[PDB]
Write an enzyme that holds these catalytic residues in place. Sequence first.
Site, short mmCIF file in Angstrom:
data_model
loop_
_atom_site.label_atom_id
_atom_site.label_comp_id
_atom_site.label_asym_id
_atom_site.label_seq_id
_atom_site.Cartn_x
_atom_site.Cartn_y
_atom_site.Cartn_z
N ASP A 295 0.84 -1.20 0.00
CA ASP A 295 0.00 0.00 0.00
C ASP A 295 0.87 1.25 0.00
OD1 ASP A 295 -2.05 -1.87 0.28
OD2 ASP A 295 -2.09 -1.66 2.46
N1 LIG Z 1 -10.90 -7.01 2.50
C1 LIG Z 1 -10.14 -5.83 2.73
N2 LIG Z 1 -10.55 -4.64 2.23
C2 LIG Z 1 -9.83 -3.49 2.43
N3 LIG Z 1 -8.68 -3.51 3.14
C3 LIG Z 1 -8.20 -4.69 3.67
C4 LIG Z 1 -8.91 -5.88 3.48
N4 LIG Z 1 -8.21 -6.88 4.12
C5 LIG Z 1 -7.10 -6.33 4.68
N5 LIG Z 1 -7.09 -4.99 4.42
C6 LIG Z 1 -6.07 -4.02 4.84
O1 LIG Z 1 -4.89 -4.28 4.13
C7 LIG Z 1 -3.78 -3.74 4.87
C8 LIG Z 1 -2.57 -4.61 4.65
O2 LIG Z 1 -2.10 -4.52 3.31
C9 LIG Z 1 -4.25 -3.61 6.33
O3 LIG Z 1 -4.25 -2.24 6.72
C10 LIG Z 1 -5.69 -4.15 6.31
O4 LIG Z 1 -6.59 -3.44 7.14
#
Ligand SMILES: Nc1ncnc2c1ncn2[C@@H]1O[C@H](CO)[C@@H](O)[C@H]1O
Length: 339
Positions: free
Chosen positions: A294
Amino acid sequence: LSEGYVFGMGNPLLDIIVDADDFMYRKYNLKKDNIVLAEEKHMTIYDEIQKKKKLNYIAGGATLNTVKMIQWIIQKPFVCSYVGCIGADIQGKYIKNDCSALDLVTEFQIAEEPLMTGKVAVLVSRSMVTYLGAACDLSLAHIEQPHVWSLVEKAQVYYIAGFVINTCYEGMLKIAKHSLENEKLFCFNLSAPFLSQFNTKEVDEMISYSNIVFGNESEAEAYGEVHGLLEDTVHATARYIADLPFADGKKRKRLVIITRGKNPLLYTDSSDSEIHQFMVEQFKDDQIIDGAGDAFAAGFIADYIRGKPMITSLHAAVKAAAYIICRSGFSLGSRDSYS
Ligand SMILES: Nc1ncnc2c1ncn2[C@@H]1O[C@H](CO)[C@@H](O)[C@H]1O
Ligand SMILES: [Cl-]
């Protein structure tokens, strides 16, 4: 950059980080560095980890992480906007206030009670179990509101993770159609392998509106497999995604970036017949692909929208991921301590 220049929409989640025991992974059948949507067999995990001591609570969400770090990098307040759905709870208040601290303009939707703010079980020893919760209630009606759609209108750059397909596909699609129609910069992330497997129609459609497509190796392999790209799947996938027709038919460059952990990332575009390698910085048992993924998107976008060339933006992308790697999880500290 003007205020609200960057718009993001996604799933506002609360990350619950805990040092997990060995049985936890076997009990809930969790793999390494993977993300799974909470099924009925997973539901006991949230009460089970709540008994644990030294619980760490961090505002999460794939799209939110990227957008808020873009805001953090650029430094100028209110440049980024975010839209998501939280619950009427203290968890939603934590997320909301965490955005305001970063000078991030938000228009959260409040789900009907008692639907609580979504959460992610982050089991470290690092596996993720996600309960979307209130994030599912994100609707087109909330987006089409005058004071909400204004943030979409004023923005010139969009970032939406593929995760939003499960929650509000109709919303992200409308923003995508708006972006292409107004010749804006729509950035998309494959987010997870299961999206290309079970939501292939939605992914390919979003790609037809995307100017920049982010992804990793596992997502590319899953995408290429479901598209019949058997030999040299990863390379074939990047070429396939880059060469897909845009939804309006106009010829333009779509950029495709595929991260490959500690191995060189791949990048190419519609007008490029070659797929280039990009050497990445090495770390101590950590990689650019993961939380750091991210940040990679955030670091690339923050520079690319400010006129920086491709190569320079890629270094800014690696730099941003390296920063999150160096810290515990996705937390943004002092801005001057970023170099
Ligand atoms: N289904 C999802 N939709 C949006 N964000 C997500 C999902 N699953 C995990 N995350 C987020 O992805 C991040 C890790 O890459 C964490 O901050 C987590 O909250
Ligand atoms: Cl998201």
